Swiss-Prot record, chain A:
Assigned protein family: Belongs to the universal ribosomal protein uL30 family.
Function: Component of the ribosome, a large ribonucleoprotein complex responsible for the synthesis of proteins in the cell. The small ribosomal subunit (SSU) binds messenger RNAs (mRNAs) and translates the encoded message by selecting cognate aminoacyl-transfer RNA (tRNA) molecules. The large subunit (LSU) contains the ribosomal catalytic site termed the peptidyl transferase center (PTC), which catalyzes the formation of peptide bonds, thereby polymerizing the amino acids delivered by tRNAs into a polypeptide chain.
Subcellular localization, as worded in the UniProt entry: Cytoplasm
Note: Present with 101000 molecules/cell in log phase SD medium. There are 2 genes for uL30 in yeast.
Location of the region described as Disordered in the Swiss-Prot/TrEMBL record: 1-23
Organism: Saccharomyces cerevisiae (strain ATCC 204508 / S288c) (Baker's yeast)
Name under which the protein is recorded: Large ribosomal subunit protein uL30A
Subunit structure: Component of the large ribosomal subunit (LSU). Mature yeast ribosomes consist of a small (40S) and a large (60S) subunit. The 40S small subunit contains 1 molecule of ribosomal RNA (18S rRNA) and 33 different proteins (encoded by 57 genes). The large 60S subunit contains 3 rRNA molecules (25S, 5.8S and 5S rRNA) and 46 different proteins (encoded by 81 genes).
Disulfide bonds: none
UniProtKB/Swiss-Prot annotation, chain B:
UniProt protein name: Protein MAK16
Role of this protein: Its role might be as part of the apparatus concerned with the nuclear events of the cell cycle.
Span within the parent record: 2 to 102 of 306
Organism: Saccharomyces cerevisiae (strain ATCC 204508 / S288c) (Baker's yeast)
Extent of the signal sequence: none
Membership in a protein family: Belongs to the MAK16 family.
Swiss-Prot record, chain D:
GO cellular component terms attached to this protein's record: nucleolus; nucleus; preribosome, large subunit precursor; preribosome, small subunit precursor
Pfam families: Nop52
UniProt name for this protein: Ribosomal RNA-processing protein 1
Designated gene of the protein: RRP1
InterPro entries with a match to the protein in the record: RRP1
Organism: Saccharomyces cerevisiae (strain ATCC 204508 / S288c)
Major localisation: nucleus
Organism classification: Eukaryota, Fungi, Dikarya, Ascomycota, Saccharomycotina
Swiss-Prot record, chain E:
Top-level division of the source organism's lineage: Eukaryota
Stored InterPro entries: Ribosomal_eL32, Ribosomal_eL32_CS, Ribosomal_eL32_sf
Protein name as annotated: Large ribosomal subunit protein eL32
GO molecular function: structural constituent of ribosome
GO cellular component labels: cytoplasm; cytosol; cytosolic large ribosomal subunit
Alphabetically ordered keywords of this record: Cytoplasm, Phosphoprotein, Ribonucleoprotein, Ribosomal protein
Predominant subcellular localization, coarse grouping: cytoplasm
Family, per entry: Belongs to the eukaryotic ribosomal protein eL32 family.
RNA sequence: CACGGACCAAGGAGUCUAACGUCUAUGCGAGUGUUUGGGUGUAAAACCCAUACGCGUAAUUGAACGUAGGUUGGGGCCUCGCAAGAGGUGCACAAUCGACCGAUCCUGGAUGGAUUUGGUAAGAGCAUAGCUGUUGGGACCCGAAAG
RNA sequence: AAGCUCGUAUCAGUUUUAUG
């Protein structure tokens, strides 16, 4: 039979995936915020 | 338990520990992968363990589980390691499936 | 500030190790208070009599608010109607344990309380008198 | 007693204990008695499972332990509008004993043996909701099972039962229900009452809100 | 490995360790208030202090780059199998030449560097 | 209820007879308490020693006072013998009166609370239930069929050492008996000639409920010690304050342990005694931390190591790459140089 | 200035004891202390305790009418909320004002009470281990006119 | 050295204005 993965390991993997699905979106949000902040800083310096 | 055993062997004179001048606590136990008496390395402090030992030219993958803690006479099981290096590595990985990295 | 426990008891060291992680990863001040109290010396941890717990349980909604004591719980013959409630402490005296159990309550260790209430919801920490 | 062989240190004796229990349990007339005997038998089975710590064999033991529920009063009767008389009440006692043993001996499970008990409870839950009548659909059987299960595992008002078991139940309920293969009494979603029951464990409420109510099903 | 920078190679010597024979070379701090060494006046012997602390990344490492580890028998030698690069087997002075050859053979078999090989041996 | 431990025959075979766990091995393990109690007790068997009070006083000497340009320490009078003029009564003088002579009324025994003594004994007994702890004690228990080792009561009836040693070898204690009689080394230091000439490592401990000859049969084999369930000496259970001695128990002794130390049904069999209550429900903290309930209310964790940031300060006004990062307007500045604007 | 130092091997000095304390640790806990002894014993070892005894458990005669206390803060917990913050509930601790029962100090052996009074308030203590302080014993070591 | 609260409005071998 196929050795089933540990239940604790399955829960850990699910939690890691759920956290990564939000961290990835937060990375893009941070990149967009950084771009906007750079534009604002450029205009303020000018 | 493991925590009680771990702390007793750590701070209550583990018999097989060796103190090097550099300040590293060694472990001469034959059943340890590493000769350092740190946590998750000393076989006595962990219920689950895996190690490689040889008596004849053949190499054997030694491991233990809580199924045999109550019976030290059958504490450690072994399997021929398929001394072909490429086959041996994959066999070890398959045997240690789901084990700690 | 006291940062380590002077007690040589390994069990207290394990409790401190668990509570440090709980406080650092939860952010709830309830864990911080218990962790800080765990370092208190014996003179700084006076026993909490069962009578004190019984009289403190008159607080509104205290029936469902499990009481917590960081010291030791001692029996008290001055009372005979200890409310049915759950009390968590490091050590429970034989008389206090019998009184709590006989009254339909329960006695648990600090680790059990932490598992039941990782965030300390409905918890009530009592401190023994010093005067 | 029978529990002595189930908790024996010898594998041969332990396996023979289960082999004999397969009939001792289908001897229903003998087992239609107080729930204390069922609790003791399940406590012995707990030790029997505890004595095996090998991945594949532990799954082999877990599957048979879960199938023991189906073995109890196999639905060959086909109870056409018949109540729990002498058939389902006895199985309710076995189910109650299983949960009592699991809750009482929860913290005693070591770190490595936790996965074994998670698999065992998953298998037992799969056998449950599969065997109430010949299949899941049954009004009175579901009502009795809910009242005899809601009060122990998912109560959430009594801190005596650790919330880890409710967490596992939340995580595996939908995974195991779909294993039965579209409409079912799934009245079973208890979870709304837990959410409405204020002062309950906030961790359990958050877990049920996130993992359970967020599913499209 | 990181360079082995020795902050103070010269061995520290006790004040007047050479002026009087009754004063051992072992360092001992001067206790008198009037002592010039205690006040570290210019031109006096250097006084050991926290400044000369060797770095952890190179502490206890011999110039060859291997840490010394006393070995009493084959059992002790076998413990360095997983740390051959970082540790070297050093035979104790009390080991008879009979066991020294056996220890050296095992060290060569395992590739463990020997700090003082051939001691008491003849070819 | 409690789990059961199989009973092994004198030939190593595991007999079908099984006994429940005596509930004593589940008591808390407190290395600090055991160490303190052992240290206090070990001083009880200490014989007092002292220096002769009349030593040094058997000399006639008086201080010369001054004027002789010599030390004021009293010097023996008379002449011709040669001892005259030598210092006396001084701790610094040769053959003088040693400073702070050891008196006979110095403390030798240490008072220990009976409850603490029982706690230490219970902890030592419990420590024997863990094979890993016993292995860390230095006993070659790697081949014992079961732990704790339970043997049939017929072992107590053995009268000849030749049979007892054979039974111990068969059951699995052969390794420990070989370890003993091998580590026998001559005493190091001045103890060589104080009746402490030889020393050896401790051997297996045998526990019996009744004495029929085993105590005499096993006394001659080095390392092996015999004790009664009622006594269960702490000095023997944890020699050197180190827990986890290899102990062999008889099934009758295993049953009698419940009565001698108490259980959940028989209170203690001792007036006013009760086993200490654990302050932790789960011995291992990892299970609590890794439990689903706690992990569900725990914030995410890092990579276990902090990533170094700004390890080296790049100086602006040079290395234009870093300058643009601080001020994006630097590019526009450099487009016309922004500095040579003509009014 | 002076006190000692020609040199070297060995020797050489806050050590022990009794009482009274702080702190720390352990055991029990309103109980505590087996070891003056008795039983037992592989024998100064190891293991148990019948009766008494020291301490505390309560006293200005006696303290439940109530959180064996209202109010205000007060670690903490809960609801509201993304936060700020609001509300509800509160250990020890602090302020205020509280209840019985006795002395000031009136009153006339009481009575009613003037205004502060010291307890109950709500037990928190007993045994052992370590550093440490005072006192007496030679008292960190050497030494003086005498009887 | 150890215990409570507070990280707050707590202070200052500092300066200036107002009460002479």
């Amino acid at each position: 039979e196929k050795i089933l993965t540990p239940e604790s390991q399955l829960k850990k993997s699910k939690a890691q995936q759920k956290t990564a699905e939000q961290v990835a979106a937060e990375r893009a949000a941070r990149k967009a915020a950084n771009k906007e902040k750079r534009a604002i800083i450029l205009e303020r310096n000018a | 338990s493991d925590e009680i055993v771990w702390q007793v062997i750590n701070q209550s004179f583990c018999s097989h520990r060796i103190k090097a001048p550099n300040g590293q606590n060694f472990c001469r136990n034959e059943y340890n992968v590493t000769g350092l008496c740190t946590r998750q390395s000393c076989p006595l402090a962990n219920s689950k363990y895996a190690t490689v030992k040889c008596d004849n030219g053949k190499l054997y993958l030694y491991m233990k589980t809580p199924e045999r803690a109550h019976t030290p006479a059958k504490l450690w099981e072994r399997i021929k390691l398929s001394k072909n290096y490429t086959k041996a590595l994959q066999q070890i990985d398959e045997h240690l499936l789901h084990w700690s990295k | 500030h006291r940062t380590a426990p002077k007690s040589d008891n390994v069990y207290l060291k394990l409790l401190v190790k668990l509570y440090t992680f709980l406080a650092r990863r939860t952010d709830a001040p309830f864990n911080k208070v218990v962790l800080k109290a765990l370092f208190l010396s014996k003179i700084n941890r006076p026993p909490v009599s069962v009578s004190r717990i019984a009289r403190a349980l008159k607080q509104e909604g205290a029936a469902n608010k499990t009481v917590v004591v960081v010291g030791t719980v001692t029996d008290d013959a001055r009372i005979f109607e200890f409310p049915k409630t759950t009390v968590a402490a490091l050590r429970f005296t034989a008389g206090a344990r019998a009184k709590i159990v006989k009254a339909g309550g329960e006695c648990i260790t600090l680790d059990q309380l932490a598992v039941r209430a990782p965030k300390g919801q409905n918890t009530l920490i009592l401190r023994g008198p010093r005067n | 007693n029978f529990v002595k062989q189930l908790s024996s240190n010898n594998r041969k004796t332990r396996v023979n204990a289960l082999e004999a229990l397969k009939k001792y349990l289908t001897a229903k007339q003998f087992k239609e008695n107080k729930q204390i005997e069922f609790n003791k038998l399940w406590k012995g089975l707990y030790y029997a499972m505890w004595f095996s710590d090998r991945p594949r064999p532990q799954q082999r033991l877990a599957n048979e332990l879960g199938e023991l529920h189906g073995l109890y009063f196999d639905p060959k009767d086909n109870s056409t509008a018949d109540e729990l008389t002498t058939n389902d009440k006895a199985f309710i006692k076995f189910s109650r004993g299983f949960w009592k043993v699991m809750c009482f001996e929860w913290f005693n499970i070591d770190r490595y043996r936790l996965d074994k008990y998670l698999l065992l409870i998953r298998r037992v839950l799969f056998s449950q909701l599969k065997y109430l009548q010949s299949r899941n659909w049954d009004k009175k059987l579901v009502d009795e099972y809910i009242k005899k299960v809601l009060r122990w595992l998912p109560l959430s008002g009594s801190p005596k039962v650790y919330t880890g078991i409710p967490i596992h139940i939340v995580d595996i309920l939908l995974d195991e229900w779909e294993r039965l293969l579209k409409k079912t009494p799934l009245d079973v979603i208890i979870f709304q009452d837990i959410v409405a029951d204020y002062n309950n464990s906030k961790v359990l409420r958050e877990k049920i809100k996130e993992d359970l109510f967020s599913d499209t099903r | 490995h990181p360079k082995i920078v020795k902050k103070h190679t010269k061995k520290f010597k006790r004040h007047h360790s050479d002026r009087y024979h009754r004063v051992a070379e072992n360092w001992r701090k001067q206790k008198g208030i009037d002592s010039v060494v205690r006040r570290r006046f210019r031109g006096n012997i250097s006084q050991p202090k926290i400044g000369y602390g060797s770095n952890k990344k190179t502490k206890f490492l011999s110039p060859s780059g291997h840490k010394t580890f006393l070995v009493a028998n084959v059992k002790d030698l076998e413990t360095l199998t997983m740390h051959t690069k970082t540790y070297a087997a050093e035979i104790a002075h009390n080991i008879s030449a009979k066991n020294r050859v056996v220890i050296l053979a095992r060290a060569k078999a395992l590739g463990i560097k020997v700090t003082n090989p051939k001691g008491r041996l003849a070819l | 209820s409690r789990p059961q431990v199989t009973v092994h025959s004198l030939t190593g075979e595991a007999t079908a007879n099984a006994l429940p766990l005596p509930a004593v091995f589940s008591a808390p393990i407190r290395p600090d308490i055991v160490h303190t109690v052992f240290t206090s007790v070990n001083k009880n068997k200490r014989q007092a020693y002292a220096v002769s009070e009349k030593a040094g006083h058997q000399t006639s000497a008086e201080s010369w006072g001054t004027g002789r340009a010599v030390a004021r320490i009293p010097r023996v009078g008379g002449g011709g013998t040669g001892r005259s003029g030598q210092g006396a009564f001084g701790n610094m003088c040769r053959g003088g009166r040693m400073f702070a002579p050891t008196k006979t009324w110095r403390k030798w025994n240490v008072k220990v609370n009976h409850n603490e003594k029982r706690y230490a004994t219970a902890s030592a007994i419990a420590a024997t239930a863990v094979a890993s702890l016993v292995l860390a004690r230095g006993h070659r228990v790697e081949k014992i069929p079961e732990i704790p080792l339970v043997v049939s009561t017929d072992l107590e009836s053995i009268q000849k050492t030749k049979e007892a040693v054979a039974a111990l070898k068969a059951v699995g204690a052969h390794s420990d008996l070989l370890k003993v009689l091998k580590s026998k080394k001559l005493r190091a230091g001045k103890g060589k000639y104080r009746n402490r000439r030889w020393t050896q490592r401790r051997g297996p401990l045998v526990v019996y409920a009744e004495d029929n000859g085993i105590v005499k049969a096993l006394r001659n084999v080095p390392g092996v010690e015999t004790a009664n369930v009622a006594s269960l000496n702490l000095l023997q259970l944890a020699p050197g304050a180190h827990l986890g001695r290899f102990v062999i128990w008889t099934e009758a002794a295993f049953t009698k342990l419940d009565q001698v130390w108490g259980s959940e049904t028989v209170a203690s069999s001792k007036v006013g005694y009760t086993l200490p209550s654990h302050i932790i429900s789960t011995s291992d903290v990892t299970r609590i931390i890794n439990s689903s309930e706690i992990q569900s209310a725990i914030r995410p964790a890092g990579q276990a190591t902090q990533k170094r940031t700004h390890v080296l300060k790049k100086n602006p006004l040079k290395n234009k790459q870093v300058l643009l990062r601080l001020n994006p307007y630097a590019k526009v500045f450099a487009a016309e140089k922004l500095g040579s604007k003509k009014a």
